[PDB]
């Protein structure tokens, strides 16, 4: 599993389905947003679409 280098979205894809940036296997932490509209944590994380995200990522 990889994470978008820009938005941290988690995927097996080498390219983020949201923002088209490269993804990396080198990621840490897990935030699963089930309901972006109702999640205060998602809002603090700048997440507005459902999915799973890393907390930090590097190349």
Site membership for other proteins, residue 3 (CB under 8 A): no
Partner interacting with residue 28 (select from other proteins, Zn ion, none; CB below 5-8 Å by kind)? other proteins
Q: Is 19 annotated as a binding residue?
A: yes
Q: Which residue has the tokens 């309901």?
A: 35
Site for other proteins in 25-54 (CB under 8 A): 28-35, 38-42, 44-45, 52
Full DSSP string of 38-57? T-HHHHHTT--S-EEE-SEE
Q: Can you tell me the distance from the alpha carbon of 10 to that of 59, in angstroms, rounded to the nearest whole number?
A: 14
Binding site for Zn(2+): residue ranges?
Answer: 4, 7, 16, 19
Binding site: residue ranges?
Answer: 4, 7, 16, 19
């Amino acid at each position: 599993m990889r994470a978008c280098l820009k938005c941290k979205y988690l995927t097996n894809d080498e390219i983020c389905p949201i923002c088209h940036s490269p993804t990396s296997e080198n990621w840490i932490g897990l935030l699963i947003v089930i309901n972006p509209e109702k999640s205060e944590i998602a809002k603090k994380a700048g997440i507005d679409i459902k999915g799973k995200y890393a907390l930090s990522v590097k190349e």
